Structures are given as structure tokens and as C-alpha cells.
Design an enzyme around this catalytic site. Structure first.
Site, PDB file in Angstrom:
ATOM      1  N   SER A  42       0.817  -1.192   0.000  1.00  0.00           N
ATOM      2  CA  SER A  42       0.000   0.000   0.000  1.00  0.00           C
ATOM      3  C   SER A  42       0.853   1.244   0.000  1.00  0.00           C
ATOM      4  O   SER A  42       1.740   1.397   0.842  1.00  0.00           O
ATOM      5  CB  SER A  42      -0.934  -0.003   1.217  1.00  0.00           C
ATOM      6  N   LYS A  43       0.564   2.125  -0.959  1.00  0.00           N
ATOM      7  CA  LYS A  43       1.174   3.455  -1.072  1.00  0.00           C
ATOM      8  C   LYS A  43       0.997   4.296   0.221  1.00  0.00           C
ATOM      9  O   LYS A  43       1.896   5.035   0.612  1.00  0.00           O
ATOM     10  CB  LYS A  43       0.572   4.174  -2.291  1.00  0.00           C
ATOM     11  N   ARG A  44      -0.157   4.152   0.875  1.00  0.00           N
ATOM     12  CA  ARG A  44      -0.468   4.857   2.132  1.00  0.00           C
ATOM     13  C   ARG A  44       0.025   4.131   3.411  1.00  0.00           C
ATOM     14  O   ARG A  44      -0.207   4.621   4.529  1.00  0.00           O
ATOM     15  CB  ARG A  44      -1.976   5.174   2.212  1.00  0.00           C
TER      16      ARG A  44
END
Ligand SMILES: N[C@@H](CCC(=O)O)C(=O)O
Length: 484
Positions: free
Chosen positions: A249-251
Site C-alpha cells: 500500500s502506497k499509504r
């Protein structure tokens, strides 16, 4: 000649996933002696800005992922998408859809209630001039949809997946190819349109994609046919997985190439790594390879057909190996601003000889370049505080005798030989009536504040060049004496 391309949208920084795809492209093109094309999908979006394009190119160059063509910018090509879509309308292979999002949502809800496949029902394929005009007078403006045959068998020999087969009915109905615009105007072209128009124009022979976008593949194949082109080969790779096995996940955590770089990971180590995330090297190649070597042997057959879990321990294992490949002079240069950034007081020019010695010492056991900060602390912070073990070591009955011997017999001359150093420990031990181990351990406590750490003789050599062993031995002797 094999032609492949990277097509990032500059909607965010270069992330590991994208760069991984770029690695496979560069690797496949190089293997087959082909071209690597870079296409920037710069959109009218709030998200698309030149700072992400900058970060994309920077990261690719830095990773050694040299393109042969481009960057070709999407925004320069707007009319080609306009032409393609107009050709589709003229041919009656595309049409005007006046169906509102609120109308689509009600359709979709009525589909779920009825146990019908979730899709656009193709309701606006054959509208009469009267029907269009009624929508227009109520202030509606249409999108443009491309007709897909429900009963069409779409199939391709994927280079990673094998035969992949879709029905036309599985594509969610006639797909929007242009955003809302009045009739006689064409709206902003959607992704699937743009990519086929550009892949046809750029003569792409092989598309490398993440398996999460496998469903666009049958849609695009239909566009190629409608535009009179033969699709290229497709290779759908599995995504990079978590440390445990879900989506990266980028976040959640670190994924951007600029962040890994900032953290002290080297470009060749990142490259070698991303490759290892999905590609297992042939027998004899090993896990430590350049991109030039990975190219000699790369094939889609050898792509691990499921998610590669991202492992910090393996990235570190590689990075350590590349850091060790760095020349001592280059390596030191990487460290200086790091140490400078920590607020460590030194002079690049004046303090060079021991700074270098410090680099020589710290090199073999760094996982990241950033590790030189905490690992250098003992050589840049003047005072040492003693840990629970150091304090108890200096609390030993003969500690004062050891230290006082050392302090009295330290050479004035700046360079401490390993010979002179062993002579001292041996003689401090003889004075106290102790073994060399306890002596070294007392010296360690004095010089570092710990009972264990980096090679002692070398740490002492460094600290001697600074003239710092002398006040440290004095501070430890005074500490030994307060117990007494
Ligand atoms: N950005 C997507 C799709 C772009 C494309 O390669 O056509 C990917 O590479 O997975």
C-alpha cells in the site's frame, strides 16, 4: 525488433511497483536487443503535475533504467486520441451515451437485486435524432462509448499467465472512451483508448503489466481490432506483496524510489532487488547481479507466478553487498553530509585521515548509508556515557590500575600502530594481574561506553588521531575511582 514502453501517470512519485515494471521492460528489451520507450500520461487532472514527472525520470535514470525513446508526453498527442475516437463514431463503432451517473447507479442496484451481471446495459446504442435532442434540451451532454459484442470470445496467449479467455459480456458493457462533451465535440479520452492509440503509433510489440489491470487487456484488444491493428503480446506480472502477503500500500510504509534513496539504499541494490521480486535467476547466475547480467538471462517463463513478499532483510542483504562495492573515496563522500546533517562537528579537509579510517571501519556492516549516523556517534560525540555493563566493568577491582597504565603510556605521536596498541593492552594487563580480554573490555568501556561494538583497535586508532582516547581514558579512570 522488440519495442516495449513504460507508461506512468505523473499522479504521484515513482513507486516500487512501477519501477519494477520498468525493470522487467528494460530487462526484456535489452535481452531481445530492443527499444525501451517512455511515455508520460500527463492528464488534465488535479493530480498530474510536473514535480511527479521530474521524480519519475530522476528515479528511472538513477536506477539505470535508460530509455531509448522519449519521454513522449500524452498532452502533445491529444489530437491523435480525438482522431481515433472520431473514426470510431464515423464507423458507428462508438456512440453517444446520455446516461447519467445517478442512472448508472440505479441500473447497478437493480442488477444486484436481480442477480444480474454488474454492467452498463448498452441502452443508448441506437438512439434516434429525436431521443438525442430530448436529452440535449434537458441539458444533458453525452459521453462516447465503444461497442462491445456480448457474445465475443476474446483470448490471448499471455507471456506470464498463459491462455487468458474473456467473453465480451464480461467487460461491463460498452465502455466509455471519451468523457462528457457536446455532440460535435469529443471529451477527454479515457485510459484504454489512449494506450491502444499510443501503442499502435509507437509500434509496441510487447506490453508488460501488473495482473491487477489484466481486465483492461480484453478491452484494449477490441480497440486495436476496431482501429485495424494487431495487438502486441501481453505479459501480466504479479504485484509486489506485503511483508506478510497482502497488497503493498502506497499509504502504508515506504514504496517510492526517492524514499528508499533518501533512506540510504543504493540504486544497483534497488534494481537487483525489484528484479528478485518476481524473477528467480537461473542456476549459476545467483542473487547478486547487475542489470546487464539480468538481461543476458531474463525470460517471462521464470517469473514467480504469485506475489513476491517485500523483505527488508533481503533488500538490506543486497544493499550491504553494494555498499561494499563502493570505492572508499566515493563511500566517504556519501557519509559526510549524513554526519554533517546529524550535527556532528568535523572538518572535511582537516579531519580527513581519521574520517576515511572511520569509513573503512563502518563500511563492512552497514545495511543502509543512514546507519553511519548512529554507528558514528561514538566518534563524533566527545563524551561517552557508560551503559549498565560498562559501569559494572569499570566497577571491577583492577579497572583503575588498567586505565591508569594505559593513560600514562599513550604515545604522543598521532598514528597508533596495531603493534603499539597490543603492547599497551599486554602491559596494562601485566600491571593489573589480569588477562588481555578483561583489559580490552575495560579499554572498550573507556573508549565507547559499551562492552561490545566495532573493532576495538581500529576504534582506538580513530579516536587516537582525534586525540580523544586520552580524555576518555581519563573519564573512565575517574569513574573507576568513584566506585573505589
Ligand atoms: N499503469 C498500468 C497500466 C499502463 C500500461 O502499461 O498500459 C501498469 O503498468 O500496470
Amino acid at each position: 525488433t522488440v519495442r516495449v514502453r513504460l507508461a506512468p501517470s505523473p499522479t504521484g512519485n515513482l513507486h516500487i511497483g512501477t519501477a519494477r515494471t520498468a525493470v522487467f521492460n528494460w530487462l526484456y528489451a535489452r535481452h531481445r536487443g530492443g527499444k525501451f520507450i517512455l511515455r508520460i500520461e500527463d492528464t488534465d487532472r488535479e493530480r498530474s503535475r510536473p514535480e511527479y514527472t521530474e521524480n519519475i525520470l530522476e528515479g528511472l535514470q538513477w536506477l539505470g533504467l535508460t530509455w531509448d525513446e522519449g519521454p513522449y508526453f500524452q498532452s502533445d498527442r491529444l489530437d491523435l486520441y480525438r482522431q481515433a475516437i472520431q473514426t470510431l463514431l464515423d464507423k458507428g463503432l462508438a456512440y453517444y451515451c446520455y446516461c447519467t451517473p445517478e442512472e448508472l447507479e440505479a441500473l447497478r442496484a437493480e442488477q444486484k437485486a436481480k442477480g444480474q451481471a454488474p454492467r452498463y446495459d448498452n441502452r443508448h446504442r441506437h438512439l434516434t435524432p429525436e431521443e438525442q435532442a430530448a436529452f440535449e434540451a434537458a441539458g444533458r451532454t453525452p459521453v462516447i462509448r465503444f461497442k462491445i459484442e456480448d457474445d465475443r470470445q476474446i483470448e490471448w496467449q499471455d507471456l506470464v499467465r498463459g491462455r487468458v479467455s474473456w467473453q465480451g459480456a464480461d467487460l461491463g458493457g460498452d465502455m466509455v472512451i471519451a468523457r462528457a462533451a457536446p455532440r460535435g465535440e469529443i471529451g477527454y479520452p479515457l485510459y484504454n483508448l489512449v494506450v491502444v492509440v499510443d501503442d499502435i503509433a509507437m509500434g509496441i510489440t510487447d506490453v508488460i503489466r501488473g495482473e491487477d489491470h489484466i481486465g483492461n487487456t480484453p478491452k484494449q484488444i477490441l480497440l486495436y481490432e476496431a482501429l485495424g491493428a494487431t495487438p502486441p503480446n501481453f505479459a501480466h506480472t504479479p504485484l509486489i506483496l506485503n511483508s506478510t502477503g497482502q497488497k503493498l500500500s502506497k499509504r502504508d510504509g515506504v514504496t517510492s524510489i526517492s524514499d528508499f534513496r533518501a533512506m540510504g539504499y543504493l540504486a544497483p541494490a534497488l534494481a537487483n532487488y525489484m528484479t528478485l521480486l518476481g524473477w528467480s535467476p537461473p542456476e549459476g547466475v545467483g542473487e547478486l547481479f547487475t542489470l546487464d547480467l539480468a538481461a543476458k538471462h531474463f525470460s517471462f517463463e521464470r517469473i514467480n507466478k504469485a506475489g513476491a513478499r517485500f523483505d527488508w532483510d533481503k533488500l538490506n542483504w543486497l544493499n550491504r553487498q553494494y555498499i561494499q562495492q563502493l570505492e572508499p573515496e566515493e563511500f566517504l563522500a556519501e557519509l559526510i553530509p549524513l554526519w554533517q546533517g546529524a550535527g556532528y562537528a568535523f572538518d572535511e579537509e582537516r579531519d580527513r585521515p581519521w574520517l576515511f579510517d572511520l569509513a573503512q571501519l563502518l563500511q563492512p556492516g552497514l545495511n543502509t548509508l543512514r546507519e553511519a549516523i548512529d554507528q558514528g556517534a561514538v566518534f563524533f560525540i566527545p563524551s561517552v556515557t557508560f551503559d549498565s555493563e560498562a559501569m559494572a566493568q569499570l566497577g571491577q577491582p583492577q579497572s583503575a590500575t588498567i586505565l591508569a597504565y594505559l593513560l600514562e603510556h599513550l604515545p604522543a605521536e598521532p598514528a597508533l600502530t596495531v603493534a603499539m596498541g597490543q603492547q599497551l593492552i599486554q602491559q596494562a594487563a601485566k600491571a593489573a594481574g589480569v588477562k588481555k580480554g578483561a583489559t580490552m573490555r575495560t579499554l572498550r568501556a573507556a573508549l565507547t561506553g559499551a562492552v561490545h561494538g566495532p573493532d576495538l583497535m581500529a576504534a582506538w586508532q580513530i579516536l587516537h588521531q582525534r586525540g580523544w582516547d586520552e580524555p576518555r581514558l581519563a573519564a573512565a579512570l575517574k569513574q573507576a575511582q568513584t566506585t573505589s
